[PDB]
Amino acid sequence: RNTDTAEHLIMWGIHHPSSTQEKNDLYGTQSLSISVGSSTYRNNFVPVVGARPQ
Amino acid sequence: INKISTGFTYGSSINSAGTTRACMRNGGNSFYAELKWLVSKSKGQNFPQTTNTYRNTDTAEHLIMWGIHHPSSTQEKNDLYGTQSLSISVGSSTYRNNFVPVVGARPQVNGQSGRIDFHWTLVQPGDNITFSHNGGLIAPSRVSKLIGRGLGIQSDAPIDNN
Amino acid sequence: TNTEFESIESEFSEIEHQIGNVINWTKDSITDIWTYQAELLVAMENQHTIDMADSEM
Numbered sequence: 066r067n068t069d070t071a072e073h074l075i076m077w078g079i080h081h082p083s084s085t086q087e088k089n090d091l092y093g094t095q096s097l098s099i100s101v102g103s104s105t106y107r108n109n110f111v112p113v114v115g116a117r118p119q
Numbered sequence: 120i121n122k123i124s125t126g127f128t129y130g131s132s133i134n135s136a137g138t139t140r141a142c143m144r145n146g147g148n149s150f151y152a153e154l155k156w157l158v159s160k161s162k163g164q165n166f167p168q169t170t171n172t173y174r175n176t177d178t179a180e181h182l183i184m185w186g187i188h189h190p191s192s193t194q195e196k197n198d199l200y201g202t203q204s205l206s207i208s209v210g211s212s213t214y215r216n217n218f219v220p221v222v223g224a225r226p227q228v229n230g231q232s233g234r235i236d237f238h239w240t241l242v243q244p245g246d247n248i249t250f251s252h253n254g255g256l257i258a259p260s261r262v263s264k265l266i267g268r269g270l271g272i273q274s275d276a277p278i279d280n281n
Numbered sequence: 282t283n284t285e286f287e288s289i290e291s292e293f294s295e296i297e298h299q300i301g302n303v304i305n306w307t308k309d310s311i312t313d314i315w316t317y318q319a320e321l322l323v324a325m326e327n328q329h330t331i332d333m334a335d336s337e338m
């Protein structure tokens with residue numbers, strides 16, 4: 066709730082695991098999904114596992 | 120421009136010799152000269168999951184380009200790839216993205232009712248870029264490098280040499 | 282002070298509307314300075330030449 070006279074900057078992040086063994090541990094076995102919403106900003110994301118250089 | 124091969128190798132169950140009628144050469148079926156269309160060895164069999172990497176060693180960055188396939192109907196993806204879900208994961212030390220083939224009806228262009236869309240990225244020297252694909256990927260076999268500076272002219276007038 | 286210039290828009294393909302307008306605005310606003318600057322600059326050289334040559338007499 067932005068009960069103030071001026072607009073505030075809000076920042077967040079999303080995780081992208083490195084292997085199937087990782088997501089099953091940190092979160093679980095179901096499907097992950099994130100929904101954001103305000104009166105002006107609507108968006109949706111989803112973690113996806115893959116392989117990457119270290 | 121200079122071209123450097125990638126050295127990718129694929130397993131027994133992957134057919135990297137896919138060809139289409141709409142890209143002709145010498146009167147026979149053909150495909151893009153630098154992209155390999157992977158498909159299942161035998162129609163209906165689930166595409167095996169594989170991972171590939173490009174190992175850069177030159178002193179300058181190379182321009183790597185690839186593409187993804189969007190079938191035309193459910194009867195197609197079940198044949199070329201299989202019945203399981205398709206998904207493609209890419210990753211380097213600087214570039215991350217995820218894609219997924221999706222099927223739907225479309226107008227016919229040339230003799231094909233499907234589509235293929237291309238992406239690209241710059242691979243910095245000494246780095247690795249990884250392709251983790253389960254199906255639908257159209258992998259590269261050569262990666263270009265751009266050298267020097269020049270001029271680009273956009274006109275249709277006849278050339279003159281004197 | 283010659284400086285080479287490149288192309289910033291395609292003569293056969295299309296450009297996005299949002300950025301195409303900004304490119305268009307700058308070009309027409311820069312052509313309006315050279316045209317104005319050249320007319321007056323020459324008029325100040327014609328003016329002096331007439332006066333100069335008449336003093337030599």
Ligand SMILES: *[C@@H]1O[C@H](CO)[C@@H](O[C@@H]2O[C@H](CO)[C@@H](O[C@@H]3O[C@H](CO)[C@@H](O)[C@H](O)[C@@H]3O)[C@H](O)[C@H]2NC(C)=O)[C@H](O)[C@H]1NC(C)=O
Pocket residue numbers: 296297298301302305
């Ligand atoms: C940015 O500036 C360019 C150049 O001034 C604009 O392109 C011009 O667009 C107009 C239409 O808004 C074209 O006029 C029409 O073109 C054809 C000619 O066969 C025909 O439909 C009409 O008789 C009329 O003349 C004009 O040709 C075109 N100029 C060029 C050189 O292609 C452009 O629209 C401006 N804005 C943007 C967002 O690009």
Ligand SMILES: *[C@@H]1O[C@H](CO)[C@@H](O[C@@H]2O[C@H](CO)[C@@H](O)[C@H](O)[C@H]2NC(C)=O)[C@H](O)[C@H]1NC(C)=O
Pocket residue numbers: 118119174212245246247
């Ligand atoms: C890119 O891949 C290369 C191998 O092609 C990796 O090199 C290995 O790096 C580890 C960690 O430092 C070393 O222990 C190994 O000996 C290296 N292998 C070889 C064959 O030299 C490299 O780490 C990967 N990542 C980057 C950023 O280059």
